[PDB]
């Protein structure tokens, strides 16, 4: 729904 795509693009790949 929101910007829940944060754990898909972690600071450390």
From Swiss-Prot:
Record site: Cleavage: 10-12
Modified residues (Pyrrolidone carboxylic acid): 1
TM ranges: none
Top-rank taxon: Eukaryota
Post-translational modifications reported in the UniProt record: Neurotensin is cleaved and degraded by Angiotensin-converting enzyme (ACE) and neprilysin (MME).
UniProt protein name: Neurotensin
The organism of origin for this protein: Homo sapiens (Human)
Lineage of origin: Eukaryota, Metazoa, Chordata, Craniata, Vertebrata
Segment of the intact protein contained: 151 to 163 of 170
